[PDB]
Write a protein that binds this ligand. Structure first.
Ligand SMILES: Nc1ncnc2c1ncn2[C@@H]1O[C@H](COP(=O)(O)OP(=O)(O)NP(=O)(O)O)[C@@H](O)[C@H]1O
Ligand SMILES: Nc1ncnc2c1ncn2[C@@H]1O[C@H](COP(=O)(O)OP(=O)(O)NP(=O)(O)O)[C@@H](O)[C@H]1O
Ligand SMILES: Nc1ncnc2c1ncn2[C@@H]1O[C@H](COP(=O)(O)OP(=O)(O)NP(=O)(O)O)[C@@H](O)[C@H]1O
Lengths: 480, 486, 480
DNA sequence: TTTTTTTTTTTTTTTTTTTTTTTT
DNA sequence: AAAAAAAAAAAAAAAAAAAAAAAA
């Protein structure tokens, strides 16, 4: 027969929607109809495919060629449809045995020499192909991007002849290159209490507010914090890489498994810091996925932008919807905020500037003082690295909390929060007494319980103790 | 001569308007013409249908073909016009007996091998076909989506050969898979999670039992949002006839309902920064907004003082009528929006409050049946664990089911949707009740609509008390839920 | 087969994307198909190429032509695609040996007689071809514009026959004509102290602050401060030329191998001073790239634009976006600011309204005492031409500084400025009592250490000896 | 008094439909 | 002979200028 089927993937936003390239060589006169809502592949892929096939010592059908791309009601954007179309034409013309086209995808754009150039935003395609247990044969120019995954059964090719031989024959095509922290917690000299609070915050996945005078080192703590976080798992690292390449370029292989850290400037722009429209562009909120987001000088952020942060903090994703489409763009980040503890009624106005809806779901608050000149001038003779052991500790604590349930201590709800904390009478009377002394709100009490559970788990205690609650109180409260 | 008249459906908004594909072969040179305002997505079905016909071992006419997908005013958008066109071509080429197409509606998309593909937004077409008594034939990929309807006159096929064999000889096609029966026992939510907010928990229970809109006022931290979220569990499951109306909107806007919550009342909580186009109706080819997506469910408006007033002013029409006539200067769609409203507001963010107040629309707050002040939860009921945790959602849901069922006796409409033949009459106000109402009204400075929206609330309370008439104590309870602001 | 590849450039904004023109001659009927999102100006080059080849005593193929222009997803705008396409056609038709087209890059449109014509925005293409070490061949009309940069290995032709002759047998092809000011640092009046402060600032790359009565000086010394900095390399000169070209003017007479100097007036503009809008254009900040930015009367301007300078001051670039594109311009400069000693609370408010976060980044501060008649005896102070020796010393200083670590003293962090300053016990002893005298912030302390390291490294010292630290204490910040 | 922010209006931009000059 | 190259209109959104409401 003269009917062939091929597979590829079109990237809209962050998802790679599967496409089904269908070629049917009729018996009429030379034609190359390309039905399916292609925009720039319509009249351009035709000539590139023709020349690439001819120059690779192949017969180009002298027939009526009809190419139908995937779902009809789906615009198709990229230029990587030249390789699937060329292979479909060859299969339909019997120059390739089509019995071996079932399990393989194809992505790439063909030059006029038959060579394979490199398309953009390829890692999402690799993810989708591996998820479906399909071989993904890409151009050599994308070998660097594809090698991050190290997924087996993926290959790369130099030109079309290499792929045609890999299909007709079984020659190994190219495979992939095997797999082509510097700050450390130690640099934070003599802060003690704040460092320990940040350590337990990392261990519990809590969000922490850093209040202190200017030049106290808040930004340094935020920058060094990401060393605490455990190295991203393979799947999380691949998700981060996918969200990255949608924007272009990849200076990876030195940090590809270190959690992201974003510190948007307090001016920024709502569309940039939150999602993105037009062709869906992830915002600074989304590049922090599985990582840390540092909102420096929180009050100077406009409340309108901060109001949107309530969605991703609670859902783990942020969907931005336009008249055209709405995309997922996961935003499962960990928040860190910084703010000056006010300089009079000016203090009241300053605290009024801040967005209560966001500040009420920040699980922690630590006050930072300027350094002691004795420690500031003393040398960093205590150069022993320590972030390594703390990272292993955080891994252990997160594993415990996952063992309890899929929700970290930071994401427990009221019912599960009360069910997981033992909260015996011994601690209950003290808790009632303190609440009588200081009037915590409904959610402040549960934040206190969550932080107390984090501390208790850190100490390996099977149950929350009064000492743990007394410790958690110090890291509790908002503002003065 | 040979011409064929195949039927199909085109969706414009929520209604699937019938379309009559009309193929006609002439003896001229082998061209191919499509009329009837065919969009590009459907104007390129020419070669696709040609290939799907040739590959299925048929004879594609070498003749001047002329398709007429039109009532000439309606533009055709979907991609499901390939199966009707292919069958029309075959019937007009005498390869299919034209009497087989007597009362069938075909919806499908053809690949280049004849294999059928799944179109989107199929539920409205299935509903329309069922209402028209026509047989419907769809691609296998839509069998899962159309299984909810449970209509016995729908068939699914794998490729064009299957449909051709069915029409010519009737080889039974494939029927649709069984309806997805499931349970809801858990809900993972429960009415019990609300700890100690007893007074305001007994006011949502008589708003679920009377369709009354409810306004939640209170300081932050208290469980206004949590109570709103739990409210949906109170409402009874949706009657199939209503779950289909909701599933049509779900398919049109989103895709693939969950098959488990498809009979649970919807709960939508739009975020105040969302644009009016997303909240009310929609531009472009019209798409349901949040308001319509909450059809037959609960619309939770959090932070009522917020939201552009252009939106809150438009909610009067859905609350009175039940549908939003979104206009685009070319046509207006219906988009049913019969929802139950729940509001949340902060009574105080001096005389500066005048700026914060009046940002809302007074008539909207006048349309809200109830207002309950969520007091901050006290320490004794906050520290104390859930010593009592027996499930109440099931029992209360049974109560509301019974209360609704009884409520349809006098009038099917719920006591909230009851007019001045109900504020007077249905509410069998007695003499002593008349004097009590006279005294309280004269003492209280209330508008004329103030007198109304107690008779309905009092009737709801009486119905919960199984009293033939209001006993002068139900009115006493009702008064406590009226009033407004601080 | 009949298949030839040529190279050119496509200039958008400040970057000249590489484009690989690909030409294929098939056996079909006469035709001319372009590919790669070629605009009307590019896509109309068919007839121009045909006539230019025909009139140059060449043979235009009767076969079917098929030109594929570089990346398939990059629209092509410029009109300089006629020469690459003509050369590609000739190479594919065996009229030229295609080995010559290996490393050359061709630019410039073709008249209907075969004569070449100039094309706008040529400097970015020259820069890009320089970075890639590719022989660029341009129209003779563009020689008068390209040669000003003084870049070699670039040849200019008048007609297609000249280029064909050069490629076939290397017949000269002309060359960019030759490229066709004292400022005498010694001119500055007898300030001595401020001269030494400027010298250390240049040596270490520090940002310096100037104080004195309005118009009493500063600007006179600010102008000549640029003379001490080392001469720009060829690549840096071409970068500055490209930025000034996208601005839209570099005929003038600028000697591009010397550092620029920009002195925006304090009225300023939030768009011109930072970055251009509407059509992205370089702001005054980027025009100072690899130069000196002089912000006279710092208290002027506004408390927002000075915040946007925090990023480029350290990162070295400015990113301007309007949700439609992300445009990056280099902003590596050595900020020099000036301020009068304010015009009591009435005088405290003036310095209290300053941009504290940005001022904190200005390492140095000196006082310019006014002169009346002392310098009127010009001989014996102006008659030494002191610029050359200072520049030589600065070159050696930069070389040694970069040798110690890949960062100038002015861009070290709290880590290196302790591992490199290598203060012992007495050295660390002195600064403790100094800090006890004045408890400066951590940033001020590290600025002191950096200035002291600069001074020590000028004296061929192995460590930060006391004398150097005592000298560095001279400047500090003395806002009052 | 001695001084600044917030909100609205006008102008502008982008996208889509329309349109208007194409592609064959 | 058939659309896509284009000056126009509207939906929707954003920025700068301006009004003014507010505050030093
Ligand atoms: N342990 C430490 N505590 C505080 N500052 C430190 C410490 N170690 C080093 N520093 C230095 O202290 C300086 C303070 O800058 P930074 O850490 O950014 O504070 P900041 O609060 O972010 N700046 P600002 O927002 O204007 O107040 C940096 O230059 C650090 O290198
Ligand atoms: N019985 C209760 N009453 C009030 N709040 C509760 C109760 N039990 C738990 N909560 C808290 O309430 C949260 C959810 O409701 P809520 O505090 O109202 O969130 P919200 O979105 O901020 N609504 P609001 O309190 O009005 O701002 C839970 O996460 C708990 O922290
Ligand atoms: N004088 C009256 N006598 C009897 N019924 C009345 C009277 N005035 C109002 N109503 C009733 O009020 C109900 C609601 O109508 P109404 O409140 O007038 O609508 P509306 O005018 O759009 N609301 P508003 O904009 O606040 O005036 C009607 O169904 C009547 O029963």
């Amino acid at each position: 027969m003269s009917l062939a089927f091929t597979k590829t993937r079109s990237t809209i936003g962050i998802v790679a929607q599967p496409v089904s390239v269908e070629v049917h060589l009729s018996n009429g006169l030379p034609s190359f109809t390309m039905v399916g809502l292609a925009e720039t592949a319509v009249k351009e892929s035709k000539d590139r495919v023709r020349s690439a096939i001819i120059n690779s010592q192949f017969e180009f059908p002298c027939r009526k060629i009809t190419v139908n791309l995937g779902p009809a009601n789906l615009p198709k954007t990229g230029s990587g449809f030249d390789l699937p179309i060329a292979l479909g034409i060859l299969a339909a013309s019997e120059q390739i045995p089509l019995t071996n086209l079932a399990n393989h995808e194809f992505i790439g754009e063909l030059a006029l020499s038959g060579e394979l150039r490199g398309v953009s935003a390829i890692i999402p395609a690799v993810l989708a192909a591996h998820k479906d247990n399909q071989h993904l044969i890409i151009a050599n120019a994308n070998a660097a991007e594809a090698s991050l995954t190290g997924h087996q059964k993926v290959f790369t090719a130099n030109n079309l002849r290499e792929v045609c031989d890999y299909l007709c024959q079984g020659t190994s095509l190219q495979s992939l290159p095997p797999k082509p922290y510097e700050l450390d917690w130690s640099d934070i000299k003599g802060q003690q209490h704040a460092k320990n609070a940040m350590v337990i915050a990392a261990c519990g996945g809590h969000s922490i507010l850093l209040s202190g005078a200017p030049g106290s080192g808040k930004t340094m703590m935020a920058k060094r914090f990401s060393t605490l976080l455990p190295e991203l798992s393979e799947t999380q690292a691949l998700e981060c890489a996918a969200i990255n390449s949608i924007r272009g370029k990849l200076p990876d292989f030195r940090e590809w498994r270190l959690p992201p850290f974003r510190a948007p400037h307090h001016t920024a722009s709502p569309v940039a810091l939150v999602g993105g429209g037009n062709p869906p562009k992830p915002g600074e909120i989304s590049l922090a996925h599985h990582g840390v987001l540092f909102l420096d000088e929180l009050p100077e952020f406009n409340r309108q932008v901060l109001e949107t942060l309530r969605e991703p903090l609670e859902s783990g994703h942020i969907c931005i919807s336009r008249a055209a489409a709405q995309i997922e763009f996961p935003a499962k980040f960990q928040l860190i905020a910084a703010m000056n503890p006010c300089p009079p009624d000016r203090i009241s106005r300053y605290l009024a500037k801040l967005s209560a809806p966001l500040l009420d779901r920040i699980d922690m608050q630590v006050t930072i003082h300027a350094l002691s000149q004795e420690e500031l001038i003393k040398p960093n003779t205590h150069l022993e690295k320590q972030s390594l052991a703390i990272r292993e500790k955080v891994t252990k604590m997160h594993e415990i909390q996952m063992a309890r349930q899929d929700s970290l201590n930071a994401n427990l709800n009221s019912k599960t929060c009360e069910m997981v904390c033992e909260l015996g009478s011994e601690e209950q009377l003290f808790l009632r007494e303190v609440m009588s002394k200081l009037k915590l709100s409904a959610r402040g009490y549960h934040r206190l319980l969550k932080v107390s559970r984090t501390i208790a788990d850190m100490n390996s205690s099977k149950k929350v103790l009064l000492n743990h609650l007394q410790q958690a109180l110090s890291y509790k409260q908002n503002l003065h």
